[PDB]
């Protein structure tokens, strides 16, 4: 009945203005814990994750789906989708997942495919290729949209996680397409297969179709630091609105909340990084903007509890910590991630400027 919602610059669960808190699972089994029956050995940790996720006092955890292609989607031998995986399990595990976290009061965020690295050779071609695109959209995509959208805890799609890591920057006429300056910042180190236009392309398609599926959904662009999403400071904002319908026609093929990654390169926060400003002087009123991951490990040690403050208090609509499997480089352990998320505990702050209303209650579905 009642979705999260995103309205002008907060996110908004029945009238009350929410603060996303939580950390990112991001994965138990890299790809795999969805479909092809891989759900039955993941599901339970993942469960249990959210658990401590509420129990911490938090609302959202984020989770990778497709990832790398490693199970999803299923392509066939010309590179085309057939399916959400090879035993067309994905839906059914994905909305178990849902209803439980429903059950824990926690909000997901779906992320489809990851962009830092992207080493699967169809998945890259659904840049390139329309009928390949469309042939994921139309036997995968549509299908867990239609079938997941009556789903409260299901706040968000991210179509792509930090397109910047597989970007091949270039000069280009057209604002939106140009990156010139992304080169040296450290833009491309998955590799540089796309360029900024076939990343907006695929990003306006996808948004496009889920929003065609589920008008209420909410879609979003997890971006490796701040240059990415924001007008300010000389840099460029390239998933809002008219860039992404500029590269291919899709109207509604638009993000509703920006989203910026942020990390210490050297113990030095990026001089503009989210928590060297606050959410106003990005200029992006226009949507929520959420801090999708962070990590009290990669910052400035300002303090994990610190840091989720600052967020809460500087506008923010939200912040995750980097991976709660306690996993790879820049990565805090789930116990330090539990404690920070118990610095928002039982808050509800709609005093406008600060955060919201944190611990939220969550429907189940209306059906008939
Ligand atoms: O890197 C230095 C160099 O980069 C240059 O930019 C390159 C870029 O790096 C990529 O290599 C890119 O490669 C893509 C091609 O441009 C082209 O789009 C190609 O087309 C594919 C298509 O995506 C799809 O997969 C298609 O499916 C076929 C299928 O295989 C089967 O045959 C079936 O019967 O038909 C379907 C058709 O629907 O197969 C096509 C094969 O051609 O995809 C490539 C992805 O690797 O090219 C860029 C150049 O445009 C330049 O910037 C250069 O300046 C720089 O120095
Ligand atoms: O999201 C974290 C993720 O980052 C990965 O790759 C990048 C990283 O994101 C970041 O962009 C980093 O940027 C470097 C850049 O490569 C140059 O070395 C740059 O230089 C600057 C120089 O030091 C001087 O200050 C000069 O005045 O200005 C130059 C910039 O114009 O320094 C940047 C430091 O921020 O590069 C890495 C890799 O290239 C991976 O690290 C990944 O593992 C990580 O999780
Ligand atoms: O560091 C953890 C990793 O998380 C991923 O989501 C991306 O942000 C990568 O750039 C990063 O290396």
Same mark, same amino acid.
Request: glycine share 10%.
């Given at each position: 009945?009642?979705?999260?919602?995103? /309205?002008?610059?907060?996110? @908004?669960?029945? +009238? #009350?203005? &929410? $603060? %996303?808190?939580? !950390?990112? =699972?991001?994965?138990?089994?890299?790809?795999?814990?969805?479909?092809?029956?891989?759900?039955?050995?993941?599901?339970?940790?993942?469960?249990?994750?959210?658990?401590?996720?509420?129990?911490?006092?938090?609302?959202?955890?984020?989770?990778?789906?497709?990832?790398?292609?490693?199970?999803?989607?299923?392509?066939?031998?010309?590179?085309?989708?057939?399916?959400?995986?090879?035993?067309?399990?994905?839906?059914?595990?994905? /909305?178990?997942?849902?209803? @439980?976290?429903? +059950? #824990?009061? &926690? $909000? %997901?965020?779906? !992320?489809? =495919?990851?962009?830092?690295?992207?080493?699967?050779?169809?998945?890259?071609?659904?840049?390139?290729?329309?009928?390949?695109?469309?042939?994921?959209?139309?036997?995968?995509?549509?299908?867990?949209?239609?079938?997941?959208?009556?789903?409260?805890?299901?706040?968000?799609?991210?179509?792509?996680?930090?397109?910047?890591?597989?970007?091949?920057?270039?000069?280009?006429?057209?604002?939106?397409?140009?990156?010139?300056?992304?080169?040296?910042?450290?833009?491309?180190?998955? +590799?540089?297969?796309?360029?900024?236009?076939?990343?907006?392309?695929?990003?306006?398609?996808?948004?496009?179709?889920?929003?065609?599926?589920?008008?209420?959904?909410?879609?979003?662009?997890?971006?490796?630091?701040?240059?990415?999403?924001?007008?300010?400071?000389?840099?460029?904002?390239?998933?809002?609105?008219?860039?992404?319908?500029?590269?291919?026609?899709?109207?509604?093929?638009?993000?509703?909340?920006?989203?910026?990654?942020?990390?210490?390169?050297?113990?030095?926060?990026?001089?503009?990084?989210?928590?060297?400003?606050?959410?106003?002087?990005?200029?992006?009123?226009?949507?929520?903007?959420?801090?999708?991951?962070?990590?009290?490990?990669?910052?400035?040690?300002?303090?994990?509890?610190?840091?989720?403050?600052?967020?809460?208090?500087?506008?923010?609509?939200?912040?995750?910590?980097?991976?709660?499997?306690?996993?790879?480089?820049?990565?805090?352990?789930?116990?330090?991630?539990?404690?920070?998320?118990?610095?928002?505990?039982?808050?509800?702050?709609?005093?406008?400027?600060?955060?919201?209303?944190?611990?939220?209650?969550?429907?189940?579905?209306?059906?008939?």
């Amino acid at each position: 009945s009642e979705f999260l919602k995103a /309205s002008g610059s907060n996110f @908004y669960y029945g +009238g #009350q203005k &929410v $603060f %996303l808190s939580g !950390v990112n =699972f991001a994965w138990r089994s890299y790809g795999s814990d969805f479909g092809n029956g891989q759900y039955a050995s993941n599901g339970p940790a993942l469960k249990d994750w959210i658990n401590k996720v509420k129990a911490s006092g938090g609302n959202t955890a984020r989770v990778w789906v497709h990832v790398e292609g490693q199970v999803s989607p299923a392509f066939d031998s010309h590179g085309f989708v057939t399916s959400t995986d090879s035993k067309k399990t994905l839906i059914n595990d994905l /909305s178990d997942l849902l209803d @439980y976290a429903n +059950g #824990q009061n &926690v $909000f %997901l965020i779906l !992320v489809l =495919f990851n962009g830092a690295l992207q080493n699967n050779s169809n998945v890259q071609n659904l840049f390139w290729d329309e009928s390949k695109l469309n042939s994921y959209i139309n036997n995968a995509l549509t299908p867990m949209v239609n079938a997941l959208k009556s789903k409260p805890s299901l706040a968000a799609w991210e179509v792509l996680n930090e397109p910047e890591g597989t970007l091949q920057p270039g000069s280009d006429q057209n604002s939106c397409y140009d990156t010139s300056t992304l080169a040296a910042q450290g833009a491309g180190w998955g +590799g540089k297969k796309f360029p900024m236009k076939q990343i907006l392309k695929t990003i306006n398609w996808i948004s496009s179709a889920i929003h065609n599926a589920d008008s209420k959904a909410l879609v979003t662009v997890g971006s490796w630091s701040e240059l990415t999403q924001t007008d300010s400071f000389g840099y460029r904002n390239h998933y809002k609105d008219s860039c992404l319908t500029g590269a291919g026609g899709k109207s509604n093929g638009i993000i509703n909340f920006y989203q910026m990654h942020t990390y210490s390169h050297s113990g030095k926060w990026n001089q503009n990084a989210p928590f060297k400003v606050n959410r106003w002087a990005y200029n992006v009123n226009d949507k929520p903007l959420l801090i999708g991951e962070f990590a009290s490990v990669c910052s400035q040690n300002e303090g994990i509890q610190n840091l989720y403050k600052y967020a809460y208090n500087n506008g923010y609509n939200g912040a995750l910590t980097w991976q709660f499997n306690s996993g790879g480089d820049c990565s805090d352990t789930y116990s330090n991630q539990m404690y920070g998320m118990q610095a928002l505990k039982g808050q509800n702050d709609q005093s406008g400027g600060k955060g919201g209303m944190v611990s939220v209650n969550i429907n189940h579905h209306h059906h008939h």
